[PDB]
């Protein structure tokens, strides 16, 4: 019988941190809604204040901008009041929705509040649920801002602000200790008399706390003078209340009426349902008044009534006793000195983990979720890959060099002192010398079209495709990789190819090959991505600007996967000349970031493409993750003196903006990748903004940083990639995280720049030699990356280490694995083989889990082109030996040929029960969940129809000994239906089916004639009839290697009298049936002529006169089944014919099939003559052994490829993997993802070699130096 009391505090509680916490919330939908609409409400009332108050009110888009001014003390009473009221309501709301705390009720709880808390108390007490509280809570926000605004107005009219305030709002209240309230009141009266103070300016007792404590308020100038008279032992603690409250001599009923005028009049206002403990009023307990009337009284508690805080404790206790409660459980919300409440109230008295959310709901909303960087590929100066790019950085290489002749002739375009037109003072740069290389065949370009395409568009296709494969992205494989969920963004500032190179002979592909919109467009078109496609031009910040746009799309949910990149290919001498004419460029060398003699930046070439995803999606697909983007923002340097020069004021506001949005602090960042274009003004300006944000200095001069900060610029190595600078900078970070190193900085040629601040004092460093950058245990490395433009815009992001991978995974029980290689060209095929072999030699003995993961990657996480290669084994060494052997044949002159266009054709052969064995299918049953489900489903169907249980056959094995014919036959058929469905799920679409004896039933389901249950019904009831009527051991069956003519000639007695032909399997393969006595006589007669004979294990003699007695009843069983036309042709040994119509599957069919001979030859020969079968078709046995396939093979040709699924002598997966290899080489589209689905241990994307492009140089050389003569006539 405990009663919780909900107590709200006043302005004395520093709610700054609580506000910061609520802004970080993103898991409670009703909170974020309250926090979006509260500022709107707040801002709305602030617009109705007086001009004096509006001028002293800051501008803000969100509450985050008020926190710092609140902490500083420069926030006026109107906002700080509403802010405290927001924090209280916010904390209460979160506690009762996210915190799943039951809402208070009049039976077991009460609410109380002091000063501002009295407002919130009215709202809470007037609602019965969180949903109802919000609308009232928002009205309460407006009342709070009007309350502080009204008290602020009276204060300003009473006393003016003092001169040394510096914007800070002075204190109007102070706590006094060591004297009783009624004694302090007398000293006040005396002090008043002696100073002759006006009645309004007098100090007054604003609150009574305890027998010796109290609080006195007055104008600051007057309060200070009065407090100077209270000498020790008395105490004086100054409180943070910046306006007069609780002053019956300053406020009246009209002031209260004004504060609550924002509450529209209505009849639907809720009443106070939960008792409010109004201990500062005549009635300590109050309830029932309407929300406005209750709010007016609460406002009256703030302006008119003094705080009787000495009555708070007993007032609560008395209400608890009134309801027969023994104790109270305090639930304070932003209450100063709240801990003391519990004991103080109880002194007057005698005295489960949260449930996991449904999958898909645990994830936070898409808005402001970490965006994972899955992969990145690019081309950089002296670097054909990300790995060679790291070599440039870690070895401190300066890649700048004079312009090569492939671009333009420096002898005519460059001059020490440029006087002629279009001649520049510099010709330096960091160039991509292989920018012309491309694989036109791969991307479906003619040799005449490729030269016209901007190398930027080409290198975008290469890097984008490399990044996609590196990320294991296969279109439409998973939900996040659906074609309509993939978008493309690129940053590009220039189109030089279309201005200088192809413009020399405008041809048909001039526009599509030169226009920037085609940079992402070709990516969208080639990979068939129907999501958005954009190009961004913000000059030197384009790529990071595009990364910003892409992240917004992911956060908004327009796409699930994003392709982001940047391109910069320089072929127009005018651009360099123009840049030099504007003094952007360094005429001495590369970017000399941080060097005292920096004279500009050096143009650089680069192309980079990344793959992005919202972190949850990335983890759902088991994609690789190199890092995560926490935030990214953009502003503009509007406050600069010149349009070109950037300014530090705007840059810092951005750095702090992203730190706040991400919830981080300076210490959390350990590295900053700066813009750093090698400019004295730019480097000093940016450096000051970075340190003032990430390495601030104490007021005493010490370092705020506890750990060192490292700053560096990639441009000192590879120059300024302009539109591709942002992603180039980001690529460097991805490598720094991978290798856990900070590369040396080569920008400092001579001496450090003197404009920089004392970096050592701030614990900031410019690494001169490489520095270890290890990931902390159970921690993450976080980075700030900057990228600016001369147009004024600034962009920066916050980066973070990738999450820790899943520890468990699982061991792959499969002994044999399959590795798939593909290429579009014979040369590319040779390349991929070579590159895969060299890769296996590097990672040969690292771990045993590599081979399953290698298989998963090359199959499920790869597209498969027309030229194909395969290898299968149990360890990596076997795979190499196979691929090496295949490589040798390619080198010896046997070229790689593409698989036939249509792909393979399959015929499925369903075996009879003769070849079934114990423990058949157990490994399949264990490992494939779908197979287990089917068996489990069929089992329940059987028992439902009073048939034996087959699930035990796959689990127990021993039962196979004593199993009955009905159980033996059902197990076989369920096995075949489950085995067919498994192969169908793996991509085998049958061209036709053929079943032998019992195998026809499963074959009829695979053909679409019968449903699975009708098959089991038909099989079960037929076997039941055979046990009921027939007897084992009376008849037998005999296999004979001889022609039908020789068998008949050898035996005395015609067929149909002395015996019967049960099966006609081949030319010299027949099976006879009859009584044991009939077979004995025939077996001797055939052995007499030395013909090979052999009994069958079956107990009865199927397909002979023995089954005659069951045929009438079997006819009725078939009549019950629902027959439909086959979807694929049925090769029926029962009729020795290819069946295609349901007219042939009438009940007569099944009695005929049971009694009549099994004419495989006549059925097969009927199939080949129709062209349904030929040597190029693949035969797949759906049974316990390759029996029926041998009959098919004899019928079509000796070179036919036939495969078995199960075989008692070999491992199931060997056969399965060996068949899929041949299906793949034949051109089948295997469902590789399903092949690995039940094996999480293999589901890891490995970093494999990039596609072995068949590269040729496609270039349109700039000639005749015509750019230097633009505007001149022909002379």
Which residues are the active-site residues? 540, 675, 720
Label residue 567 exposed, middle or buried (CB < 10 Å: 0-12, 13-18, 19+): buried
- Least distance in Å: CB of 222 to Mg ion? 12
- Least distance in Å: CB of 1114 to a copy of itself? 12
- Least distance in Å: CB of 202 to Mg ion? 9
Q: Which of 464, 906, 975, 547 is nearest to 724 (CA)?
A: 547
Site residues for a copy of itself, 332-361, by CB under 8 A, read: 358-359
CB atoms < 10 A from the CB of 167, how many?
A: 12
Three-state DSSP state, 861: coil
Q: Which is nearer to Mg ion, 222 or 671 (CB)?
A: 222
* From candidates 20, 128, 201, 327, binder to a copy of itself by CB under 8 A: 201
- Least distance in Å: CB of 191 to Mg ion? 9
Are 1218 and 793 in contact, with CB atoms under 8 Å apart?
no
Q: Which is nearer to Mg ion, 193 or 638 (CB)?
A: 193
Tell me the helix, strand and coil percentages in the chain, rounded to 5: 40, 15, 40
* DSSP-assigned letter for residue 404: P
- CB half-sphere exposure, 1149, CA atoms < 13 A: 25
- Give the binding-site size for a copy of itself (rule: CB under 8 A): 39
- Residue 564 interacts with a copy of itself (CB under 8 A): yes or no: no
Q: Which does 359 bind (CB under 5 to 8 A by kind): Mg ion, a copy of itself, none?
A: a copy of itself
Peptide bond preceding 233 in cis form (omega within 30 of 0): yes
Pairwise CA distance, residues 714 & 725, whole Å: 9
Q: Which is nearer to a copy of itself, 91 or 222 (CB)?
A: 222
Show the site string, 981-1010: x = touches a copy of itself by CB under 8 A, - = not: ---------------------------x--
Pairwise CA distance, residues 1017 & 43, whole Å: 75
* DSSP-assigned letter for residue 761: G
Sign of the Cα torsion 914, 918, 922, 925 reads positive
- Residue 1012 interacts with a copy of itself (CB under 8 A): yes or no: yes
Pairwise CA distance, residues 1001 & 983, whole Å: 17
Residue with tokens 């180039």: 728
Q: Which is nearer to a copy of itself, 114 or 1019 (CB)?
A: 1019
Q: Which of 125, 134, 89, 112 is nearest to 291 (CA)?
A: 125
Q: Which helix (H) or strand (E) holds 975?
A: helix 965-985
Q: Which is nearer to a copy of itself, 223 or 1220 (CB)?
A: 223
Residue with tokens 């992203």: 658
- Residue 142 interacts with a copy of itself (CB under 8 A): yes or no: yes
Q: Could you tell me where the DSSP H helices lie in 4-50?
A: 16-24, 29-46
* DSSP characters over 1245-1269: ----PPP----EE------TTGGGG
CB atoms < 10 A from the CB of 403, how many?
A: 21
- Residue 160 interacts with a copy of itself (CB under 8 A): yes or no: yes
Pairwise CA distance, residues 147 & 251, whole Å: 11
Q: Which is nearer to Mg ion, 1032 or 1116 (CB)?
A: 1116
Q: Which helix (H) or strand (E) holds 486?
A: strand 486-491
- Least distance in Å: CB of 1133 to a copy of itself? 24
- Least distance in Å: CB of 198 to a copy of itself? 4
Point out which span in 183-191, 199-207, 404-412, 427-435 binds a copy of itself (CB under 8 A). 199-207
Q: Which is nearer to a copy of itself, 628 or 1012 (CB)?
A: 1012
Site residues for a copy of itself, 655-674, by CB under 8 A, read: none
Site residues for a copy of itself, 925-964, by CB under 8 A, read: 937-938, 941, 944-946
Site residues for a copy of itself, 1014-1033, by CB under 8 A, read: 1014, 1017
Point out which span in 155-163, 542-550, 636-644, 884-892 binds a copy of itself (CB under 8 A). 155-163
Three-state DSSP state, 1063: strand
Pairwise CA distance, residues 1196 & 1176, whole Å: 9
Q: Which is nearer to a copy of itself, 199 or 778 (CB)?
A: 199
Pairwise CA distance, residues 424 & 511, whole Å: 29
Show the site string, 355-394: x = touches a copy of itself by CB under 8 A, - = not: ---xx-----------------------------------
Q: Which is nearer to Mg ion, 230 or 713 (CB)?
A: 230
Q: Which is nearer to a copy of itself, 16 or 1013 (CB)?
A: 1013
Q: Which of 981, 1069, 1072 is nearest to 1035 (CA)?
A: 1072
Sign of the Cα torsion 995, 1000, 1002, 1008 reads positive
Q: Which does 157 bind (CB under 5 to 8 A by kind): Mg ion, a copy of itself, none?
A: a copy of itself
* DSSP characters over 862-906: S---SEEEEEEESSHHHHHHHHHHHHHHHHTT----PPPSS---E
- Least distance in Å: CB of 945 to Mg ion? 14
Give me the residues paired with residue 873 across strands: 817
Q: Which does 219 bind (CB under 5 to 8 A by kind): Mg ion, a copy of itself, none?
A: a copy of itself
- Least distance in Å: CB of 199 to a copy of itself? 5
CA 244 to chain centre: 53
- Residue 199 interacts with a copy of itself (CB under 8 A): yes or no: yes
Q: Which is nearer to a copy of itself, 420 or 945 (CB)?
A: 945
Q: Which does 638 bind (CB under 5 to 8 A by kind): Mg ion, a copy of itself, none?
A: none
* DSSP characters over 334-345: S-TTGGGHHHHH
- Least distance in Å: CB of 1005 to a copy of itself? 9
Are 635 and 648 in contact, with CB atoms under 8 Å apart?
no
Helices vs. strands in the chain: H and E counts, helices first: 42, 39
Pairwise CA distance, residues 314 & 1226, whole Å: 89
- Least distance in Å: CB of 194 to Mg ion? 6
- Residue 197 interacts with a copy of itself (CB under 8 A): yes or no: yes
- Residue 219 interacts with a copy of itself (CB under 8 A): yes or no: yes
User: Which positions touch Mg ion (CB under 5 A)?
Assistant: 193
Show the site string, 1109-1138: x = touches a copy of itself by CB under 8 A, - = not: -------x--xxxx-xx-------------
- Least distance in Å: CB of 143 to a copy of itself? 9
Pairwise CA distance, residues 416 & 588, whole Å: 11
For the chain, what is the radius of gyration of the CA atoms?
43
Strands 235-238 and 173-177 turn out to be antiparallel
Q: Which is nearer to Mg ion, 612 or 1117 (CB)?
A: 1117
Contacts to a copy of itself by CB under 8 A: 142, 153-154, 157-160, 162-163, 196-201, 219, 221-222, 358-359, 937-938, 941, 944-946, 1008, 1011-1014, 1017, 1116, 1119-1122, 1124-1125
């Amino acid at each position: 019988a405990q009663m919780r009391v909900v107590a709200f505090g006043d302005q004395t509680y520093d709610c700054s941190e609580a506000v910061s916490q609520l802004l970080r919330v993103r898991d409670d939908a009703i909170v974020v809604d309250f926090l979006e609409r509260a500022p709107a409400v707040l801002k709305a009332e602030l617009a109705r204040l007086s001009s004096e108050q509006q001028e002293e009110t800051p501008r803000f888009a969100t509450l985050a901008e008020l926190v710092p001014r609140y902490r500083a003390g420069t926030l006026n009473p109107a906002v700080s009041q509403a802010l405290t009221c927001i924090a209280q309501l916010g904390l209460f709301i979160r506690q009762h929705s996210s915190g799943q705390e039951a809402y208070p009720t009049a039976h077991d709880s009460c609410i109380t509040g002091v000063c501002t808390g009295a407002l919130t108390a009215v709202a809470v007490g007037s609602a019965s649920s969180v949903t109802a509280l919000v609308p009232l809570a928002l009205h309460t926000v407006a009342v709070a801002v009007r309350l502080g605004a009204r008290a602020w107005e009276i204060g300003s009219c009473l006393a003016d602000a003092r001169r040394g305030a510096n914007g800070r709002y002075a204190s109007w209240t102070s706590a006094v200790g060591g004297i009783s309230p009624q004694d302090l009141q007398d000293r006040i009266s005396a002090y008043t008399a002696e100073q002759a103070l006006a009645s309004v300016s007098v100090p007054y007792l604003s609150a009574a706390v305890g027998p010796g404590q109290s609080s006195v308020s007055a104008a600051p100038v007057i309060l200070d003078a009065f407090l100077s008279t209270l000498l020790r032992p008395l105490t004086t603690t100054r409180l943070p209340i910046t306006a007069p409250y609780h002053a019956p001599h300053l406020f009246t009923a009209k002031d209260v009426q004004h504060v609550t005028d924002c509450l529209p009049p209505s009849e639907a206002w809720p009443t106070v349902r939960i008792p409010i403990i109004s201990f500062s009023r005549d009635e300590a307990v109050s309830r029932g008044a309407s929300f406005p009337a209750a709010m007016s009284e609460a406002v009256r508690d703030c302006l008119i009534r003094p705080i009787a805080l000495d009555r708070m404790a007993v007032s609560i206790a008395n209400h608890a006793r009134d309801l027969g409660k023994d104790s109270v459980l305090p639930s304070p919300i932003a209450l100063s000195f709240s801990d003391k409440l519990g004991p103080q109230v109880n002194s007057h008295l005698p005295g489960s983990k949260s449930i996991p959310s449904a999958i898909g709901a645990e994830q936070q909303p898409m808005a402001k979720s970490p965006i994972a960087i899955l992969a990145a590929s690019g081309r950089f100066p002296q670097s054909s890959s990300m790995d060679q790019f790291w070599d440039v950085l870690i070895n401190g290489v300066d890649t700048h060099e004079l312009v090569p002749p492939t671009r333009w002739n420096a002898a005519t375009h460059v001059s020490e002192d440029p006087k002629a037109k279009n001649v520049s003072g510099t010709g330096f740069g960091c160039w991509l010398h292989e920018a012309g290389e491309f694989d036109a065949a791969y991307f479906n370009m003619s040799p005449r079209e490729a030269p016209q395409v901007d190398p930027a568009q080409r290198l975008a296709l290469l890097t984008a495709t490399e990044a996609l494969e590196q990320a294991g992205v296969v279109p439409n494989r998973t939900s996040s990789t659906q074609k309509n969920r993939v978008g493309v963004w690129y940053g590009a500032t220039s189109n030089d190819w279309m201005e200088t190179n192809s413009a020399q002979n405008v041809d048909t592909y001039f526009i599509p090959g030169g226009n920037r919109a085609f940079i992402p467009g070709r990516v969208n078109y080639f990979h068939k991505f129907s999501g958005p496609s954009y190009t961004i031009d913000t000059a030197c910040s384009s790529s990071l600007a595009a990364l910003h746009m892409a992240c917004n799309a992911l956060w908004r949910g327009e796409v699930d996967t994003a392709i982001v990149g940047g391109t910069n290919v320089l072929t127009n001498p005018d651009m360099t000349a123009g840049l030099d004419a504007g003094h952007f460029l360094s005429r001495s060398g590369n970017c000399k970031t941080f060097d005292d003699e920096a004279d500009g930046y050096c143009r650089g070439e680069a192309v980079v493409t990344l793959i992005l995803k919202r972190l949850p999606d990335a983890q759902a697909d088991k994609d690789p993750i190199q890092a995560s983007i926490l935030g990214i923002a953009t502003n503009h340097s509007a406050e600069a003196a010149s349009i070109t020069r950037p300014h530090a004021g705007a840059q810092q506001d951005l750095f702090q903006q992203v730190l706040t949005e991400t919830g981080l602090t300076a210490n959390d960042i350990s590295v900053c990748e700066m813009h750093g274009t090698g400019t004295q003004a730019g480097d000093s300006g940016e450096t000051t903004s970075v340190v003032e944000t990430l390495a601030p200095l104490n007021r005493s001069g010490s370092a705020v940083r506890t750990t060192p900060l490292y700053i560096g610029a990639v441009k000192s190595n590879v120059g300024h990639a302009e539109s591709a600078a942002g992603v180039s900078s980001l690529a460097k970070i991805l490598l720094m995280l991978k290798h856990s190193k900070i590369p040396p900085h080569v920008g400092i040629k001579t001496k450090l720049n003197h404009r920089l601040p004392d970096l050592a004092a701030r614990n900031t460093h410019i690494a001169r030699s490489e520095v270890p950058w290890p990931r902390p245990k159970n921690g993450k490395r976080r980075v700030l990356l900057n990228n600016f433009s001369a147009a004024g815009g600034n962009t920066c992001l916050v980066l973070e280490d990738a999450p820790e991978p899943e520890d468990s995974q699982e061991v792959d029980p499969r002994e044999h694995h399959i590795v798939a290689l593909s290429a579009k060209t014979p040369d590319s095929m040779v390349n991929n083989l070579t590159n895969m072999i060299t890769w296996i030699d590097k990672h040969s003995g690292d771990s045993l889990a590599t081979l399953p993961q290698l298989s998963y990657t090359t199959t499920a996480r790869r597209v498969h082109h027309r030229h194909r290669a395969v290898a299968t084994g149990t360890d990596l060494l076997q795979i190499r030996s196979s691929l090496q052997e295949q490589l040798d044949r390619r080198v010896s002159g046997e070229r790689s040929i593409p698989h036939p266009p249509n792909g393979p054709s399959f015929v499925l052969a369903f075996t009879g029960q003769g070849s079934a064995f114990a423990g058949m299918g157990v490994d399949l049953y264990k490992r494939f969940a779908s197979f287990r489900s089917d068996i489990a489903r069929y089992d329940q169907i059987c028992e439902g129809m009073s048939l034996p249980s087959i699930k035990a056959m796959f689990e127990d094995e021993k039962v196979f000994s004593t199993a009955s014919p009905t159980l033996q036959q059902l197990t076989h058929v369920c096995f075949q239906m489950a085995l067919y469905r498994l192969w169908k799920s793996l991509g085998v679409q049958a061209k036709a089916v053929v079943g032998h004896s019992l195998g026809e039933y499963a074959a009829l389901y695979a053909a679409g004639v019968l449903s699975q249950s009708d098959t089991l019904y038909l099989v079960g009831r037929r076997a039941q009839l055979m046990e009921k009527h027939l007897s084992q051991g009376t008849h037998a069956m005999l296999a004979v290697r001889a022609k039908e003519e020789a068998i008949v000639a050898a035996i005395d007695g015609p067929p149909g009298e002395a015996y019967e032909f049960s099966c006609r399997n081949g030319e010299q393969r027949n099976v006879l049936g009859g009584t044991v006595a009939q077979i004995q006589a025939a077996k001797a007669a055939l052995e007499a002529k030395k013909i090979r004979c052999q009994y069958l294990d079956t107990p009865m003699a199927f397909h002979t006169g023995q089954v005659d007695p069951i045929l009438p009843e079997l006819l009725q069983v078939a009549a019950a089944c629902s027959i439909q036309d086959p979807q694929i042709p049925v090769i029926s040994p029962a009729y020795g014919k290819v069946i295609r119509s349901a007219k042939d599957f009438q009940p007569e069919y099944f009695t005929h099939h049971c009694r009549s001979s099994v004419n495989m030859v006549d059925a097969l020969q009927s199939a080949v003559e129709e062209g349904l079968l030929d040597k190029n078709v693949i035969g797949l046995e759906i049974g316990p052994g390759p029996v029926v396939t041998q009959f098919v093979k004899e019928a079509v040709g000796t070179t036919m490829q036939t495969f078995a699924s199960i075989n008692k002598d070999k491992d199931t997966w060997q056969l399965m993997t060996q068949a899929l290899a041949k299906f793949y080489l034949a051109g089948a589209s295997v469902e590789w993802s399903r092949y690995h689905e039940d094996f999480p241990g293999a589901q890891k994307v490995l970093e494999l070699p990039a596609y072995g492009w068949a590269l040729k140089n496609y270039w349109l050389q700039y000639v005749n130096d015509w750019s230097l003569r633009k505007g001149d006539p022909a002379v």
